[PDB]
Amino acid sequence: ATQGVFTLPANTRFGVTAFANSSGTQTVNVLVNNETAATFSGQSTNNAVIGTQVLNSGSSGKVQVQVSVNGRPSDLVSAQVILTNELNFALVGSEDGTDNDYNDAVVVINWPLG
Ligand SMILES: *C(=O)C[C@@H]1O[C@@H](C)[C@@H](O)[C@@H](O)[C@@H]1O
Ligand SMILES: [Ca+2]
Ligand SMILES: [Ca+2]
Known part of the structure; x- marks a missing residue:
């Protein structure tokens, strides 16, 4: 997926x-x-x-x-969660190796701004 x-x-x-x-x-x-x-x-x-x-x-x-x-794509987990129908998080976890902690790069996308 x-x-x-x-x-x-x-x-x-x-x-x-x-x-x-x-x-x-x-x-x-x-x-x-x-x-x-x-x-x-x-x-x-x-x-x-x-x-x-x-x-x-x-x-x-x-x-x-x-x-x-260094060019090797990590494996990604992600989801989007919405609070009070307005505040949005697009969350990304990432795993580069063996231990499957999926925090190797943690990426957070949030909106709206301002
Ligand atoms: C190699 O060690 C794997 C790698 O680095 C570790 C320090 C740990 O963060 C592990 O989660 C990561 O995949
Ligand atoms: Ca890892
Ligand atoms: Ca890690």
Whole structure:
């Protein structure tokens, strides 16, 4: 089942924040309408943020997150959760190796902003 793929409301600003918990330098790409929109890198085993940015969902609102470590794509878990019918989280977990903790890069997408 596809993961890291999120339909947002069109032409809406959203925040995207990534955290690293791994030996591997995480490289997370944030694609809007299949065009690369953000790119983050950093290495941490202590939940350091390797990038935070404000993007626009574009005309299509298709946001996709991808995680790789030196070119090897990680395995992704994701879901979207909505609180009081207004506050949206698109959550991404990512696993680069053996232990299946799925926090190697943690990516949080939240909206609306402002
Ligand atoms: C290799 O050690 C795997 C890797 O790095 C560890 C420090 C730990 O974060 C593990 O979850 C990660 O996949
Ligand atoms: Ca792991
Ligand atoms: Ca980890």
